[PDB]
């Protein structure tokens, strides 16, 4: 069972993956986010956020309004299954979540909630396999 993934968000507003697989034998799954490049948090800060496909737009919109000092997420947002903090270059963060939080049939999306980043396609799918 492969129960973690290392993902990078760079100074050019991209993740180095578009698709995450979660082994369904995993009890927990861990995302390790890092930020190659030179740009600080306030310029090109990234996070990793998990929601259902349907909820992503809302999470992003409300997170935009919540703003930078809230790490671009509505605090305690019920739609956020898991999330890292916002990180700048040189910084890192991990998040671990229960795999039981994912449903059969459902469609899940990961993304950066930082202003404009998801629109520029800092997103992809997350799928139970
Ligand atoms: Cu970002």
Swiss-Prot record:
It comes from Pseudomonas aeruginosa (strain ATCC 15692 / DSM 22644 / CIP 104116 / JCM 14847 / LMG 12228 / 1C / PRS 101 / PAO1). SUPFAM superfamilies: Cupredoxins. GO terms for cellular component: periplasmic space; plasma membrane. PANTHER family: AURACYANIN-B, OUTER MEMBRANE PROTEIN H.8. Residues 1-129 form the Plastocyanin-like domain. It holds the Pfam family Copper-bind. Transfers electrons from cytochrome c551 to cytochrome oxidase. Disulfide bonds join 3-26. GO terms for molecular function: copper ion binding; electron transfer activity; identical protein binding; transition metal ion binding; zinc ion binding. Cu cation binds at residues 46, 122. It is found in: Periplasm. This is Azurin. Keywords: Copper, Disulfide bond, Electron transport, Metal-binding, Periplasm, Signal, Transport.
